[PDB]
Design an enzyme around this catalytic site. Structure first.
Site, PDB file in Angstrom:
ATOM      1  N   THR B  13       0.825  -1.432   0.002  1.00 22.80           N
ATOM      2  CA  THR B  13      -0.081   0.039  -0.185  1.00 22.80           C
ATOM      3  C   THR B  13       0.748   1.274  -0.019  1.00 22.80           C
ATOM      4  OG1 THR B  13      -1.496  -1.089   1.067  1.00 22.80           O
ATOM      5  CG2 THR B  13      -1.889   1.404   1.252  1.00 22.80           C
ATOM      6  N   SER B  45       1.660  -7.786  -0.253  1.00 24.61           N
ATOM      7  CA  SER B  45       2.384  -8.429   0.601  1.00 24.61           C
ATOM      8  C   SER B  45       1.718  -9.838   0.889  1.00 24.61           C
ATOM      9  CB  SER B  45       3.079  -7.928   1.638  1.00 24.61           C
ATOM     10  OG  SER B  45       2.227  -7.385   2.813  1.00 24.61           O
ATOM     11  N   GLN B  46       0.182  -9.653   0.636  1.00 27.98           N
ATOM     12  CA  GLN B  46      -0.412 -10.985   0.819  1.00 27.98           C
ATOM     13  C   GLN B  46      -0.060 -12.042  -0.211  1.00 27.98           C
ATOM     14  OE1 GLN B  46      -1.551  -7.919  -0.219  1.00 27.98           O
ATOM     15  NE2 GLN B  46      -3.760  -8.094  -1.341  1.00 27.98           N
ATOM     16  N   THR B  76       2.102  -4.154   4.419  1.00 26.71           N
ATOM     17  CA  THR B  76       2.299  -4.636   5.675  1.00 26.71           C
ATOM     18  C   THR B  76       1.977  -5.874   5.939  1.00 26.71           C
ATOM     19  OG1 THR B  76       0.038  -3.526   5.804  1.00 26.71           O
ATOM     20  CG2 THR B  76       1.760  -2.235   6.462  1.00 26.71           C
ATOM     21  N   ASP B  77       1.069  -6.587   5.467  1.00 22.91           N
ATOM     22  CA  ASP B  77       0.230  -7.930   5.970  1.00 22.91           C
ATOM     23  C   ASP B  77       1.447  -8.919   6.280  1.00 22.91           C
ATOM     24  OD1 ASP B  77      -1.956  -6.357   4.900  1.00 22.91           O
ATOM     25  OD2 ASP B  77      -2.573  -7.854   3.314  1.00 22.91           O
TER      26      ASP B  77
HETATM   27  N1  LIG Z   1      -2.434  -5.520   1.386  1.00 20.55           N
HETATM   28  C1  LIG Z   1      -1.504  -4.502   1.584  1.00 20.55           C
HETATM   29  C2  LIG Z   1      -1.677  -3.782   3.081  1.00 20.55           C
HETATM   30  C3  LIG Z   1      -0.727  -2.696   3.194  1.00 20.55           C
HETATM   31  O1  LIG Z   1       0.370  -2.527   2.723  1.00 20.55           O
HETATM   32  O2  LIG Z   1      -1.265  -1.691   3.761  1.00 20.55           O
HETATM   33  C4  LIG Z   1      -0.015  -5.319   1.609  1.00 20.55           C
HETATM   34  O3  LIG Z   1       0.433  -6.044   2.518  1.00 20.55           O
HETATM   35  O4  LIG Z   1       0.494  -5.390   0.484  1.00 20.55           O
END
Ligand SMILES: N[C@@H](CC(=O)O)C(=O)O
Ligand SMILES: N[C@@H](CC(=O)O)C(=O)O
Ligand SMILES: N[C@@H](CC(=O)O)C(=O)O
Ligand SMILES: N[C@@H](CC(=O)O)C(=O)O
Lengths: 311, 313, 312, 327
Positions: B13, B45-46, B76-77
């Site tokens: 994100t 990152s999922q 983040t994930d």
């Molecule tokens: N789905 C995103 C969430 C984020 O980066 O806030 C990721 O992990 O790539």
């Protein structure tokens, strides 16, 4: 001393490893207590049948007593509590309790936990707040309560919305009650059920196998809850398998492996497009409980989502 | 003179867009570093995976003497898993700092810009070296081993929930008061430089009336290891238990972890690990235990040796 | 058996509400050769400088006669005494503080196991050189960061900014952290010949705060004043003015915060250098008092006191 | 179609500014209400906003006059608007919020908001905080929940909300009983409401008041001086709140002064410096014997708010204890 009658339903757990009651002679000051053994298991082996037995027991025995305390292993107490929270129709206090330390250890927590669970069950103000878990001087609602630590005596917390009341000197100052519908206000009725729909949990992580999801699918599971990453997101292989399942007669609920906060609609996943449901604040094991029960009413993902928004 | 800092971009994100774009949106980076961006992949990152892991480790190790530190921009994930993988595989002695963002870059009060700023501050601080691979989020320096997501949406989500953070960032300066005791980076035996794949390890969840079918499917597929997300202190539903006991007997590595978000899965509790040939994960959560188990499996298949690894890294 | 020799110094507290403390926990004999001495017998709400001087001197003097110390103490001010000892103990061996949140006669009283675990920690060779420790609810906490988080919870003691050092399971400790700040034999504070400590008091900030406390401490010639500031150490205007006056007319002034976590920082809203103030960083008001008292045994100079607050 | 929302501005870091995006140094209450509103043009999508400058200060300098002004204005202007947002410094937001929680009679939403970074900072938190505050004040479901604080996507009740961290944007928590609702994509899922009596269920009415009873706070710690307590006593304070150790206990010298004070015309409340949990009755201090009142979950600065208003009705320590048990 004009005291209430409180029934203890025993299921096992570390708290109980009739003489359980005898180790808290002080129970005589606050209630007339009578115990029954329903089962005698570690809660890691908790199952649909025990749940059904217990809801049925409480509902049918409601008018013979003033309150229930259920003694129970800690590991899955949070699941049992939400399942009872949704299926109990009895208006009187229903309070689960466990112990993190064995009864034979130094500074064993079970005795005082039991005492405080009976306090809570005996308090007329505990009624109409749904099924409760009482641990470490704190009254916690069935829906939000979860374990936060593997061994801490303080592990039980309502991590999203906070506890209902604290117990000092055998008295509770309640400052909260759960807004979400529970007990008598749910459509769920297990009085005539001898089984529940099959619902399994798949975990998400870097490079996650689809093999677990595939396996549940292959077995004809009625529902799958995903323990998603971040805000209920899915690893691409698991996504693909669950996307197929959702359109092929399986209810799919997106939850999160992250311990707090909601798995929300309108974030990275178009749940409408996939036929998915977002679990909100319900963690994966909580979401299984509600998904199972939702499945006894409906297979429609939009009615399931509404259930997930109200219970 | 300012430090040379390399941003290895992976998506997330924080980017959602190329890395040039990211850097040019935070002009204040020009006052603290000479920033160069390279795009490694561009994914949520999922969808993080072993090939990207291996790419990053190799890159960092190979380009270690081209720069003074690294920032990896990431989703983040799964950041907490990459950070631990890198923490055990990087042999470079210069700071490696992962960052992301909980709000889209287009959002009101977007967190990405100041997060990236503070990541570069951390990468540029000489005091940051020899502390392992780090994650920097919400004005806080966290170690790659203990760092985890605590909330689905909160900007403050990242916490080292068992042993706490390393340092706090105020006015572009860090006050470090902690460093991780577990062995990391150049003190680990793990070396992925000649690896083109990692051993296969899956995670199964425990809950009431849990199906054994997930675990059996992993066994059937010849998985090298299985991590259990157990109930409480790493306990297993009876069916899952039976399945993993049998697997361990034929040589599958089995690690008992917990779905409970903090505290150790201990030895010497309700499961006789010695009898069953199981490993206890300590404070490593299931995704983190996977990272360690996959790496342990590149050195040994012996469960007692895997347990010593779980006690030292 | 070949067990370590561990000394219990008793100071009172609900854990006591020495010889019969020790007798209440027979399992101690499995891990340590324990001997107790009574130092004082008070509720820790009545903890005071003279008891701190007595403890520091005793530990320092008796360091060679034992393998480690456990200090039984009330919970209410244990965090204070812990940080005082952390800066003043020169003995290298473990010093572990312990209390009880529940009365000894209560259901599920915590004192027995807490004490067991405090002896475990004192006995562990790996506990050496980590500074003075507090052991509560199966967790080993450092004396600088440890504080109360709840008025009654058995789990109340936490190291709220930097986390614990280790967790205790089945009589064993997995240590993954040690405090970076300087402590014990690495400090220059030496109380061995002191009969008293410098006078430091604490004023509270809030909406419409009175200057009358601050003025009273100044009037009485206090050596320093810690402000429990709002937010990031901010001061109600009248309190600001009085502390500004005090700072330039002899009194050392430390800005701390009423807020339970986070540093009181430099470079926010208060120009500390200009006013001659010191920022407490992560030290809460009661902890900042401890350090300020000890700083004032070495220097009255506000830059040097700031340096002390950056190092200890 | 969109509701009418009134922003009453008081200053704070939300209207503060520094010399660069990247330096922490700032000054409070420079920028006017209009500048905050204009920095959030997205407000236009959810309310018709009108902004008024009440004062412009750091909340560190908040005081009884500003409180009285705010309460009177909200009660006076209740029918002019659909709800209020009060922009305010963070440092004492928790006090103003509980003050307003007890004194506002208007039964539309009153929502307080600040920012932990100034407007000029990189990733400034004010603009989204403001947006979410207005979303909260616009939501018909926010009504009859007392005065609210909205910070970091969370709706918190005025009574329990407090700062937990000196600098974290996530600092505001309801540390004993938890938040009321979380905000995502401009919507609130409310799951809780405060049980304690608030706003129009309190007897407190400040409409005719120009001053409040004098109440001060004294801190407890090892070797505590009695001099702060004695000073408040010499000035004839109406009440003293002790920030006690553990469960509201008092250092011997402080105890001695406050013992005298409670029987010599001063109301005394035992609170705690410990950040969560109640200061209880029936622990180590015999409140009845001493004429003291126990604050429950109210922290020293919150307990001062309730004691000041309690003293407008009654000087009887039994009646004040009844008030600390209901409000
Ligand atoms: N789905 C995103 C969430 C984020 O980066 O806030 C990721 O992990 O790539
Ligand atoms: N395994 C036990 C743990 C406990 O009760 O502490 C249980 O859930 O039954
Ligand atoms: N007032 C007691 C409280 C306790 O020890 O639990 C003390 O600090 O001595
Ligand atoms: N001192 C400022 C702090 C802030 O608002 O962030 C205030 O309370 O006005």
């Amino acid at each position: 001393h004009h005291l209430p009658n409180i029934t203890i339903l025993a299921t096992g757990g570390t708290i109980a490893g009739e003489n359980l009651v005898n180790a808290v002679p002080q129970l005589k000051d606050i209630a007339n207590v009578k115990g029954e053994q329903v089962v005698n298991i570690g809660s890691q082996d908790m199952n649909d049948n025990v749940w059904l037995t217990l809801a049925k027991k409480i509902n049918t025995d409601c008018d013979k007593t003033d309150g229930f305390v259920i003694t129970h292993g800690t590991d899955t107490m949070e699941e049992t509590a939400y399942f009872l929270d949704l299926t109990v129709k009895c208006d009187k206090p229903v309070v689960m309790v466990g112990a993190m330390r064995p009864s034979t250890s130094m500074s064993a927590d079970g005795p005082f936990n039991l005492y405080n669970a009976v306090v809570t069950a005996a308090d007329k103000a505990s009624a109409n707040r749904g099924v409760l878990v009482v641990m470490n001087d704190t009254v916690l609602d069935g829906r939000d309560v979860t374990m936060t630590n593997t061994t801490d005596v303080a592990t039980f917390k309502s991590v999203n919305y906070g506890p209902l009341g604290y117990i000092h000197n055998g008295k509770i100052d309640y400052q909260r009650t759960p807004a979400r519908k529970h007990t008598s206000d749910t459509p769920f009725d297990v009085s005539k059920l001898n089984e529940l729909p099959k619902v399994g949990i798949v975990y998400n992580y870097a490079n996650a196998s689809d093999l677990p999801a595939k396996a549940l699918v292959d077995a004809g599971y009625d529902g799958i809850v995903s323990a998603g990453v971040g805000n209920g997101n899915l690893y691409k292989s698991v996504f693909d398998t669950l996307a197929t399942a959702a359109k092929t007669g399986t209810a799919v609920v997106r939850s999160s492996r992250v311990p707090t906060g909601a798995t929300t609609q309108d974030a990275e996943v178009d749940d409408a497009k996939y036929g998915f449901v977002a679990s909100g604040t319900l963690n994966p094991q909580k979401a299984r409980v509600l998904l199972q029960l939702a499945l006894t009413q409906t297979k429609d993902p939009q009615q399931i989502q509404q259930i997930f928004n109200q219970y």
